[PDB]
Design a protein around this ligand. Structure first.
Ligand code: AJP
Lengths: 55, 55
């Protein structure tokens, strides 16, 4: 609605913060306002299920 | 010895080629002369063994 970045990106856009070191997943629209570095930690959607029981 | 990039990087450094779309693993020294994009294909050293079949 407001098209205002909240969170850590809006602290970088509006000059509140100087840099961000955080678990920040790189999307396109985040790069449209600020600059990422290279992805140091590649990941994705994993499948968390239970562990086979000791019954 | 010559400190001359051969291959596809030296074609980008010496103006022979315009861009590289290739299986090019990102290192530091390759970024020291040319610019990569984001890693579209993350990978690493895998373990190729035989498929086990009825020992
Ligand atoms: C309750 C809130 C709700 C929301 C809100 O309402 C109220 O609305 C928000 C709104 O959004 C406001 C934001 C708007 C966007 C603003 C952006 C501004 O930074 C801008 O301008 C520079 C800082 O002033 C930034 O980059 C500086 O800091 C480094 C960023 O990485 C740069 O690298 C450095 O450039 C170089 O400076 C000299 C040296 O080489 C090095 O130190 C440096 O590499 C720049 O520092 C200054 O660098 C000088 C030379 O470039 C200029 O002083 C200026 O750079 C250029 O700035 C141009 C801006 O027009 C200008 O035209 C051009 O001539 C200047 O050369 C810049 O200052 C640059 O990345 C960015 O664009 C920031 O500080 C404040 C800012 C975030 C504002 C903070 C407050 C808000 C968030 C408002 C507030 C939350």
């Amino acid at each position: 609605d407001t098209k205002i970045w909240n969170g850590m990106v809006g602290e970088l856009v509006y000059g509140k913060a100087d840099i961000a070191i955080a678990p920040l997943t790189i999307t396109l629209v985040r790069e449209e306002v600020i600059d990422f570095s290279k992805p140091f930690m590649s990941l994705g959607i994993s499948i968390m299920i239970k562990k086979p029981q000791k019954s």
